[PDB]
């Protein structure tokens, strides 16, 4: 792919998301979604191989079905209200269809399989962009339409997402599938807190994006896509393994790291509204995520797996490409707990 074409497609994806986030018209929001998907498909199919083609095909099918459902919901809402402005939807059936379409776009359970499938199919940069941006946009739409969301359905989908992410991450071995299930669990947390405080939703989004960027960029730096491939990193650059370990600890919600702040704020907000059982179950279920994070950290940082012989040549040579904002994302993902009251600024 030509660099000019690649940057044009990236800017088209970003422009589609910006159009979705700045448009007050349902037709314009749908147009932004269509543009985002259209420009996103080649980014997935950059490195051409049958696995990438299959991942792109599955992603296209899922996103097209979600877009059709979203347009149907828009039309149904227009039928009973005659309004195009994105506000509290005036029809429960249209609201349910919109919620299901946005859940399918985000990856919430039971619409989650395509997330690990595509993430394994595509490369690390494609997975990073996919997760981050393609979860950034529908969450903005949901935050705009929050006041009409059915709490029962939203919380059911959120809890299912958390459980499914935990169990999938427990069983998986591939780094990209682990990241996909982590994304599913964090989206579950965000959508669980969504019907109560969109500010907490945005805070969780920002923290999750920072941690995911840090983890994916560390994986790109180490050029590891499996557990055993990552197990050789300690013999070439042990600093990266330690940074990855602290990032994994933060993603598990362990205090006093940055990952504990979203869970803490969400628990507080949900327990303000006389909801105890849901926060308790959500907090207890994150232990599965922390378990597979710790299992991944054992193989890379806290132990020394056997190495190979060409690693000496690896030592002789030096990394050339420099990651952008990697130290900043590492610091922001582990040491911003004492700056929690900035959520008022985020408000």
């Amino acid at each position: 792919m030509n660099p000019i074409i690649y940057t044009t497609l990236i800017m088209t994806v970003m422009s589609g998301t910006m159009l979705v986030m700045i448009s007050s018209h349902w037709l314009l929001i749908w147009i932004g979604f269509e543009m985002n998907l259209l420009a996103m498909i080649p980014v997935l199919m950059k490195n051409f191989n049958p696995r990438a083609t299959e991942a792109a095909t599955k992603y296209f099918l899922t996103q097209a079905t979600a877009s059709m459902m979203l347009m149907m919901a828009i039309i149904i809402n227009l039928l009973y209200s005659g309004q195009w402005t994105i506000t509290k939807m005036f029809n429960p059936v249209a609201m349910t269809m919109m919620t299901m379409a946005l859940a399918m776009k985000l990856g919430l359970s039971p619409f989650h399989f395509w997330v690990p499938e595509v993430t394994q199919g595509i490369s690390l940069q494609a997975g990073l962009l996919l997760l981050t941006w393609q979860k950034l946009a529908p969450l903005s739409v949901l935050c705009q339409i929050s006041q009409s969301i059915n709490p029962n359905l939203m919380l059911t989908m959120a809890m299912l997402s958390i459980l499914i992410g935990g169990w999938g991450g427990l069983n998986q071995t591939q780094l990209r599938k682990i990241m996909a299930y982590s994304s599913i669990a964090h989206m579950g947390w965000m959508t669980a807190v969504l019907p109560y405080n969109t500010t907490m939703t945005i805070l969780n989004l920002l923290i999750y994006i920072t941690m995911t960027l840090a983890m994916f960029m560390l994986l790109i730096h180490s050029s590891a896509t499996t557990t055993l491939s990552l197990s050789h990193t300690w013999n070439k650059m042990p600093v990266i393994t330690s940074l990855m370990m602290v990032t994994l600890l933060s993603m598990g919600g362990l205090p006093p790291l940055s990952g504990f702040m979203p869970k803490w704020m969400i628990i507080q907000e949900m327990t303000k509204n006389e909801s105890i059982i849901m926060p308790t179950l959500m907090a207890m279920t994150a232990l599965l995520n922390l378990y597979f994070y710790m299992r991944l950290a054992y193989s890379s940082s806290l132990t020394m797996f056997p190495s190979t012989n060409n690693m000496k040549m690896k030592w002789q040579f030096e990394h050339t490409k420099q990651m952008k904002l990697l130290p900043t994302m590492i610091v922001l993902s582990t040491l911003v707990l004492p700056m929690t009251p900035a959520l008022s600024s985020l408000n």
């Binding site: 007050s24 018209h25 037709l27 209200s81 195009w84 402005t85 506000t87 705009q144 006041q147």
Partner: protein, 105 residues
């Protein structure tokens, strides 16, 4: 979520198309222009919760103009009663409804 660039910069990207009581080409009015205008003027500036709680008469009038559910129900009831009456033969249509009348210019 919603960065109101249109309101910040004074643009009109889609607010012209948002509602059907706005400026239409050749001043073509909508089907329910009056009802929508009344609902908007009732609900403006009081917030979503108060708009839903208070402008219920206006919203119901707008929805009735849009869908014509109650009017269709009333017409169907009248038609059903007329059909039942003419089945027994008690009621007979007038000449104009029967088809022998002079229309109006």
């Amino acid at each position: 979520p919603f960065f109101d660039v249109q309101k910040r910069l004074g643009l009109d990207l889609d607010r012209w198309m948002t509602i059907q009581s706005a400026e239409q080409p050749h001043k073509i009015p909508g089907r329910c222009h009056a009802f929508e205008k009344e609902w908007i003027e009732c609900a403006h500036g009081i917030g979503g919760i108060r708009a839903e709680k208070e402008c219920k008469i206006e919203f119901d009038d707008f929805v009735e103009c849009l869908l014509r559910q109650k009017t269709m129900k009333r017409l169907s009831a009248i038609k059903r009663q007329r059909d039942k009456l003419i089945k027994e033969g008690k009621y007979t249509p007038p000449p104009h409804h029967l088809g022998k009348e002079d229309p109006r210019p």
